[PDB]
Amino acid sequence: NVEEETKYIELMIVNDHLMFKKHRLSVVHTNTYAKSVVNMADLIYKDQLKTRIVLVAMETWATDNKFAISENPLITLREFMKYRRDFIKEKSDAVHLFSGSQFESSRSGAAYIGGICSLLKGGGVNEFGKTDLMAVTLAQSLAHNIGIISDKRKLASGECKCEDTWSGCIMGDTGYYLPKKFTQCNIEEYHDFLNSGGGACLFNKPSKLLDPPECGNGFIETGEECDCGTPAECVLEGAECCKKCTLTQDSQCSDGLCCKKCKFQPMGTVCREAVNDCDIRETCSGNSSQCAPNIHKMDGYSCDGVQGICFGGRCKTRDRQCKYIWGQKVTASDKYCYEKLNIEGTEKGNCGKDKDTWIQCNKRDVLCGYLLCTNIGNIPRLGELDGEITSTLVVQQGRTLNCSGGHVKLEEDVDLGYVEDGTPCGPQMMCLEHRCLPVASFNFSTCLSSKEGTICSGNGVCSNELKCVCNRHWIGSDCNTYFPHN
Numbered sequence: 001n002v003e004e005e006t007k008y009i010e011l012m013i014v015n016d017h018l019m020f021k022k023h024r025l026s027v028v029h030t031n032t033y034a035k036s037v038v039n040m041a042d043l044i045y046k047d048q049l050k051t052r053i054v055l056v057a058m059e060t061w062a063t064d065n066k067f068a069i070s071e072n073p074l075i076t077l078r079e080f081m082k083y084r085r086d087f088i089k090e091k092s093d094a095v096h097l098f099s100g101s102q103f104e105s106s107r108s109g110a111a112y113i114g115g116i117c118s119l120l121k122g123g124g125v126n127e128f129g130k131t132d133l134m135a136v137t138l139a140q141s142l143a144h145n146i147g148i149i150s151d152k153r154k155l156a157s158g159e160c161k162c163e164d165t166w167s168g169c170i171m172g173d174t175g176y177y178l179p180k181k182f183t184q185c186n187i188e189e190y191h192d193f194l195n196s197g198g199g200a201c202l203f204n205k206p207s208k209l210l211d212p213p214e215c216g217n218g219f220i221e222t223g224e225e226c227d228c229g230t231p232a233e234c235v236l237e238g239a240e241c242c243k244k245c246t247l248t249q250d251s252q253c254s255d256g257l258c259c260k261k262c263k264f265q266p267m268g269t270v271c272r273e274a275v276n277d278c279d280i281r282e283t284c285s286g287n288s289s290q291c292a293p294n295i296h297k298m299d300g301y302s303c304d305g306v307q308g309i310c311f312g313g314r315c316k317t318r319d320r321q322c323k324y325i326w327g328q329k330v331t332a333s334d335k336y337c338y339e340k341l342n343i344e345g346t347e348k349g350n351c352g353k354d355k356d357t358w359i360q361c362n363k364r365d366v367l368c369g370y371l372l373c374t375n376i377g378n379i380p381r382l383g384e385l386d387g388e389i390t391s392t393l394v395v396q397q398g399r400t401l402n403c404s405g406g407h408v409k410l411e412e413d414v415d416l417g418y419v420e421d422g423t424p425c426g427p428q429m430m431c432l433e434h435r436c437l438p439v440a441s442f443n444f445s446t447c448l449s450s451k452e453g454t455i456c457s458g459n460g461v462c463s464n465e466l467k468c469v470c471n472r473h474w475i476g477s478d479c480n481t482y483f484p485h486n
């Protein structure tokens with residue numbers, strides 16, 4: 001499926017000036033030192049998460065810092081992503097900072113939850129340490145980007161516990177020594193993220209790793225035609241056609257989803273099925289051994305049947321937001337809970353807070369204010385609960401409804417407990433800054449179309465790469481030309 005495939009995190013590392021000074025003003029030392037940290041973090045990911053950490057790019061600030069590095073990991077993280085948005089022009093799944101300085105709290109790093117593949121959120125910041133120690137810091141930073149959050153609700157209950165206390169578990173920063181393993185709960189959180197449609201950019205295999213070619217690492221570099229895993233794992237797949245990184249007589253490929261016996265899989269063979277209704281299925285090219293780079297519908301397509309809208313391959317509904325914060329057993333409150341409590345302007349329903357006084361929602365923006373769920377807990381899966389749980393009770397001519405809420409903080413700016421931006425609030429209307437606005441107020445980019453009022457000439461789907469994925473028998477960058485082939 002999608003959780004059985006090997007994932008690949010194309011990673012870029014940025015070393016600041018203090019990291020450069022930690023290695024005697026030597027560029028070669030810093031870069032090889034950072035490769036070691038990545039290499040060890042790869043070994044942790046390689047087995048447990050069925051995911052590989054591939055270093056694709058790196059830069060070192062030999063002269064000075066481009067921005068003011070902060071003692072607060074979150075402030076540094078935010079300013080670092082600003083730098084990478086405006087200055088970093090190399091392609092990567094995630095960009096991480098290697099800081100020579102030290103942060104205030106025992107938190108050795110900060111990274112955005114479910115951040116990968118994103119331009120503004122795909123990255124983290126990591127403080128200096130030992131090679132073995134920093135690899136753990138990177139392993140938990142990338143885990144956050146990857147969707148592994150370490151469920152607080154299950155932790156407080158005692159549901160999820162570190163079974164192998166082999167110097168503890170990684171997402172258990174509760175104790176600090178040398179955590180080498182993820183909990184089974186961690187693996188599930190990662191699977192759920194991939195099945196949710198997250199991490200689409202984690203499905204392509206790199207070729208030229210920033211290190212000289214070596215036959216037998218499982219990566220097709222310069223000079224070598226094929227490459228199976230290693231002589232041991234090679235026997236399972238590829239040993240029949242690959243020999244000394246060279247193809248045999250009857251072979252087009254060695255290993256991959258689009259490689260049957262030792263030959264290619266016919267063009268149009270389903271190699272990857274859609275994980276959700278935001279996703280697009282992938283077909284074998286008939287030309288490559290790899291299953292084509294994982295792509296999905298562009299941001300704007302409705303999901304869950306008009307109830308949600310796709311963003312980054314993930315569906316945004318109020319019910320899914322309630323489950324993300326409070327647990328799978330929790331459901332979103334009735335639309336009436338919103339329609340009545342949010343116009344009041346109390347702690348029990350509002351459009352935000354001003355000067356210690358709650359803002360009462362307009363009747364138009366009633367689904368974009370305070371997030372209301374049904375039977376809520378008192379310990380969120382992530383973030384910090386800021387205060388007490390809201391719980392009012394409204395009657396509806398025979399149906400007594402339970403509307404509940406809570407203020408869950410991640411950033412000092414970002415607050416979960418209010419309807420997330422992009423969530424549908426009506427036909428062709430979404431939430432933005434606690435306001436129900438038309439789809440135009442988001443100015444989505446579009447694919448090419450040669451028919452008035454259609455997406456991809458009405459014969460295709462607009463991908464997140466802003467390319468037209470045509471239906472059968474239709475060709476062209478706009479899917480406007482009919483070309484059947486049988």
Ligand SMILES: *[C@@H]1O[C@H](CO)[C@@H](O)[C@H](O)[C@H]1NC(C)=O
Pocket residue numbers: 267285286287288
């Ligand atoms: C491989 O085949 C595809 C057709 O699926 C074609 O578009 C592409 O140009 C080919 N690439 C090479 C290098 O032959």
Ligand SMILES: *[C@@H]1O[C@H](CO)[C@@H](O)[C@H](O)[C@H]1NC(C)=O
Pocket residue numbers: 374375376377389390391402403404405
């Ligand atoms: C309403 O939900 C709260 C938690 O959100 C719960 O404590 C309370 O018992 C519920 N009330 C009813 C009527 O079930």
Ligand SMILES: *[C@@H]1O[C@H](CO)[C@@H](O)[C@H](O)[C@H]1NC(C)=O
Pocket residue numbers: 432440441442443
């Ligand atoms: C789309 O709407 C306007 C365009 O003038 C502006 O706020 C911005 O470009 C876009 N808004 C967002 C949320 O990015």
Ligand SMILES: [Ca+2]
Pocket residue numbers: 008009010092093201202203204
């Ligand atoms: Ca990638």
Ligand SMILES: [Ca+2]
Pocket residue numbers: 213214215216217218219220221224227
């Ligand atoms: Ca190799």
Ligand SMILES: [Ca+2]
Pocket residue numbers: 272273274279280281282294295296
């Ligand atoms: Ca896909």
